[PDB]
UniProtKB/Swiss-Prot annotation, chains A, B:
GO terms for cellular component: extracellular region; immunoglobulin complex; plasma membrane. Residues 34-47 are annotated as: Framework-2. One of its GO terms (molecular function) is antigen binding. Residues 48-50 are annotated as: Complementarity-determining-2. Its main location: secreted. The lineage of its organism: Eukaryota, Metazoa, Chordata, Craniata, Vertebrata. The chain holds residues 21 to 117 of 117 of the full protein. The keyword Metal-binding does not apply. It comes from the Eukaryota. It comes from Homo sapiens. This is Immunoglobulin lambda variable 6-57. Residues 43-75 are annotated as: Disordered. Residues 26-33 are annotated as: Complementarity-determining-1.
Length: 108, 108
């Protein structure tokens, strides 16, 4: 299978843009859909690489970078409310794979 | 105890073979298992000299050279995602030791 690796921490000031990356260790990041959860239980903020569920602010964006074999969650216009852990997730034909999660600290 | 020594930096173009070596300063390199970590927290890419954990691509290979009292991590067919800090690690009857690390840059 594979693992997904993310930094544990990222920080930024309100109004600014932050990116959390999720590197896949083996295989192609493009081969399976990537979901992002914010953490109660984790809630979905991105699914199928870049789709936002109902209610999730447009400031949350998912992307895939095949060249670095990674997925990224980019949060623009950072709000205090966005402080949370964010986990990426994908699949290896059945079994769920989870990143280690990244804490977004919002400065101020 | 001992110290482990690796060159600061290795440069190589994509698709080629890079070797990063780790020399033990005292005692037998064979006497204790060598682990390699890729760096978020270190994650194991080689353990017990030459074992790849699940998720680690076959292009990564660990080896021991008793004739140079060294351990080596060899990466065939380089990829840009492989850009990281690489550290070796072994034991000295209890306590543990890390190499200074090696930056693999992928050129072009």
């Amino acid at each position: 299978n594979f693992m997904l690796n993310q930094p544990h921490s990222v920080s930024e000031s309100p109004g600014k843009t932050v990116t959390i990356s999720c590197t896949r260790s083996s295989g192609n990041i493009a081969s399976n859909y990537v979901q992002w959860y914010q953490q109660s239980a984790p809630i979905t903020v991105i699914y199928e690489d870049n789709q936002r569920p109902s209610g999730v602010p447009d400031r949350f964006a998912g992307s895939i970078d095949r060249s670095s074999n990674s997925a990224s969650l980019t949060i623009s216009g950072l709000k205090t409310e966005d402080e949370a852990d964010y986990y990426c997730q994908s699949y290896d034909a059945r079994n769920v794979v989870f990143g280690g999660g990244t804490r977004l600290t919002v400065l101020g």
